[PDB]
Structure 1
Amino acid sequence: KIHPGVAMTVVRTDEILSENILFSSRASTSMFIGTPNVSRREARVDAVTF
Protein backbone atom coordinates (compact mmCIF):
# COMPACT_ATOMS: atom_id res chain seq x y z
CA LYS A 1 0.00 0.00 0.00
CA ILE A 2 2.18 2.76 -1.35
CA HIS A 3 1.24 5.23 -4.03
CA PRO A 4 2.47 4.34 -7.52
CA GLY A 5 3.94 6.86 -9.90
CA VAL A 6 0.57 7.55 -11.49
CA ALA A 7 -2.99 8.38 -10.49
CA MET A 8 -6.12 6.87 -11.97
CA THR A 9 -9.65 8.01 -12.72
CA VAL A 10 -12.18 5.21 -12.45
CA VAL A 11 -15.04 5.64 -14.94
CA ARG A 12 -18.26 3.69 -14.43
CA THR A 13 -21.82 3.68 -15.66
CA ASP A 14 -25.09 3.23 -13.82
CA GLU A 15 -28.52 1.84 -14.67
CA ILE A 16 -31.35 3.98 -13.32
CA LEU A 17 -34.65 2.17 -13.80
CA SER A 18 -36.84 5.23 -14.24
CA GLU A 19 -40.57 5.46 -15.04
CA ASN A 20 -40.99 7.83 -17.95
CA ILE A 21 -43.97 10.02 -18.82
CA LEU A 22 -44.95 10.15 -22.48
CA PHE A 23 -47.02 13.19 -23.37
CA SER A 24 -48.17 13.75 -26.94
CA SER A 25 -50.45 16.44 -28.28
CA ARG A 26 -53.88 15.96 -29.82
CA ALA A 27 -54.02 14.88 -33.49
CA SER A 28 -50.28 14.92 -34.07
CA THR A 29 -50.10 12.17 -36.69
CA SER A 30 -52.58 10.67 -39.13
CA MET A 31 -52.31 6.91 -39.04
CA PHE A 32 -53.47 4.59 -41.80
CA ILE A 33 -54.75 1.25 -40.54
CA GLY A 34 -54.67 -1.62 -42.99
CA THR A 35 -57.02 -4.53 -43.02
CA PRO A 36 -55.41 -7.59 -41.36
CA ASN A 37 -54.19 -10.43 -43.55
CA VAL A 38 -53.68 -14.01 -42.42
CA SER A 39 -51.44 -16.44 -44.27
CA ARG A 40 -50.33 -20.03 -43.81
CA ARG A 41 -46.55 -20.01 -43.56
CA GLU A 42 -45.54 -23.55 -42.52
CA ALA A 43 -47.59 -26.68 -43.19
CA ARG A 44 -46.05 -29.81 -41.72
CA VAL A 45 -48.00 -32.99 -41.06
CA ASP A 46 -48.56 -32.36 -37.34
CA ALA A 47 -49.52 -28.68 -37.11
CA VAL A 48 -50.01 -25.94 -39.65
CA THR A 49 -48.43 -22.62 -38.69
CA PHE A 50 -50.33 -19.45 -39.51
Structure 2
Amino acid sequence: KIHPGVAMTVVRTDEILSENILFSSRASTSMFIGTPNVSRREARVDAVTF
Protein backbone atom coordinates (compact mmCIF):
# COMPACT_ATOMS: atom_id res chain seq x y z
CA LYS A 1 0.00 0.00 0.00
CA ILE A 2 2.62 2.50 -1.16
CA HIS A 3 1.56 5.39 -3.39
CA PRO A 4 3.43 5.41 -6.72
CA GLY A 5 4.43 8.82 -7.96
CA VAL A 6 1.40 9.24 -10.25
CA ALA A 7 -2.21 9.86 -9.26
CA MET A 8 -5.33 8.73 -11.14
CA THR A 9 -8.74 9.99 -12.21
CA VAL A 10 -11.53 7.46 -12.70
CA VAL A 11 -14.55 7.81 -14.99
CA ARG A 12 -17.73 5.68 -15.05
CA THR A 13 -21.12 6.16 -16.72
CA ASP A 14 -24.39 5.27 -15.01
CA GLU A 15 -27.84 4.65 -16.42
CA ILE A 16 -31.13 5.90 -15.05
CA LEU A 17 -34.67 4.91 -15.82
CA SER A 18 -36.48 8.22 -15.75
CA GLU A 19 -40.07 9.33 -16.04
CA ASN A 20 -40.61 12.41 -18.17
CA ILE A 21 -43.18 15.10 -18.86
CA LEU A 22 -44.28 16.45 -22.23
CA PHE A 23 -46.06 19.75 -22.72
CA SER A 24 -47.58 20.68 -26.05
CA SER A 25 -49.37 23.95 -26.67
CA ARG A 26 -52.85 24.31 -28.12
CA ALA A 27 -53.51 23.71 -31.82
CA SER A 28 -49.80 23.42 -32.43
CA THR A 29 -49.55 20.65 -35.05
CA SER A 30 -52.06 19.96 -37.81
CA MET A 31 -53.03 16.46 -38.98
CA PHE A 32 -54.63 15.24 -42.22
CA ILE A 33 -56.33 11.85 -41.91
CA GLY A 34 -57.41 9.51 -44.65
CA THR A 35 -60.09 6.92 -45.08
CA PRO A 36 -58.73 3.40 -44.51
CA ASN A 37 -58.49 0.51 -46.96
CA VAL A 38 -59.41 -3.15 -46.62
CA SER A 39 -57.95 -6.13 -48.45
CA ARG A 40 -58.74 -9.78 -47.83
CA ARG A 41 -56.08 -12.44 -47.69
CA GLU A 42 -57.34 -15.53 -49.47
CA ALA A 43 -59.77 -17.90 -47.80
CA ARG A 44 -58.55 -19.98 -44.89
CA VAL A 45 -60.96 -22.83 -44.34
CA ASP A 46 -62.18 -21.78 -40.90
CA ALA A 47 -61.40 -18.05 -40.87
CA VAL A 48 -60.92 -15.08 -43.18
CA THR A 49 -58.44 -12.31 -42.40
CA PHE A 50 -58.75 -8.74 -43.64
Report the TM-score, using the length of structure 2 for normalisation: 0.57
TM-aligned CA distance change 1:23 to 1:4, over 3 Å: same
Give unmatched runs, 5+ long, in structure 1.
Answer: none
Moved over 3 A (4+): 34-50
- Counterpart of 2:12 in structure 1 is 12
Larger of the two Rg values belongs to structure: 2
Task: List per-residue Cα deviations over 1:8-28 (Å, max 9, x = no partner).
Answer: 110111111110011111111
Report the structure, 1 or 2, having the larger strand content. Answer: 1
Report the TM-score, using the length of structure 1 for normalisation: 0.57
Query: In the aligned structure 2, how far is the partner of 1:18 from the partner of 1:28?
Result: 26
Identical aligned pairs, as a percentage? 100
Deviation at 1:45, TM superposition (A): 15
RMSD (Å), alpha carbons? 3.3
